[PDB]
Amino acid sequence: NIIRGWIFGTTLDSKTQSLLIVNNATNVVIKVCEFQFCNYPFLGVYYH
Amino acid sequence: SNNLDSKVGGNYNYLYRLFRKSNLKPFERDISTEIYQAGSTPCNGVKGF
Numbered sequence: 001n002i003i004r005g006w007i008f009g010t011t012l013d014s015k016t017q018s019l020l021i022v023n024n025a026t027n028v029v030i031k032v033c034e035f036q037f038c039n040y041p042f043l044g045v046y047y048h
Numbered sequence: 049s050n051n052l053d054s055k056v057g058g059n060y061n062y063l064y065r066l067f068r069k070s071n072l073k074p075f076e077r078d079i080s081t082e083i084y085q086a087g088s089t090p091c092n093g094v095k096g097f
C-alpha cells in the first residue's frame with residue numbers, strides 16, 4: 001500500500017489554493033485549501 | 049438586496065476582482081490577493097506605479 005494519495009494544484013505552496021487526496025488507514029480524505037505542504041509530504045504506521 | 053446588504057456609509061465587505069492577467073475558466077474560483085502589473089514594468093513588494 002506504499003502509494004497513499006496525491007497532491008494537485010498550481011503553486012503547491014500556500015500562496016494559492018490546492019487539492020489534497022489521501023487514503024489513510026481508515027478513510028479517503030479529499031480537501032482543497034491554501035495548503036503549506038511539507039517539502040517531502042508522506043504518511044506512516046505502527047506495525048503488529 | 050437593498051434592505052439587507054446596504055449600509056449608509058457603504059457595506060464594503062462585498063469584494064470583487066478588478067485586475068488579473070487572463071479571464072478565468074468556467075466555474076473556476078480565484079482567491080489570489082497578489083498585485084496586478086498594469087505597466088510593462090515588473091512589480092514587486094506591496095504597491096507600485
Ligand SMILES: *[C@@H]1O[C@H](CO)[C@@H](O[C@@H]2O[C@H](CO)[C@@H](O)[C@H](O)[C@H]2NC(C)=O)[C@H](O)[C@H]1NC(C)=O
Pocket residue numbers: 010069070071072073076
Ligand atoms: C492557471 O494557472 C496557470 C499558472 O499560474 C496560468 O498560466 C499562466 O498564465 C500567465 C499569464 O498568461 C503566464 O505568465 C504564465 O507563464 C502561465 N503559466 C502557466 C503554467 O500556464 C493559467 O492561465 C491559469 N488558468 C486560469 C484559467 O486561470
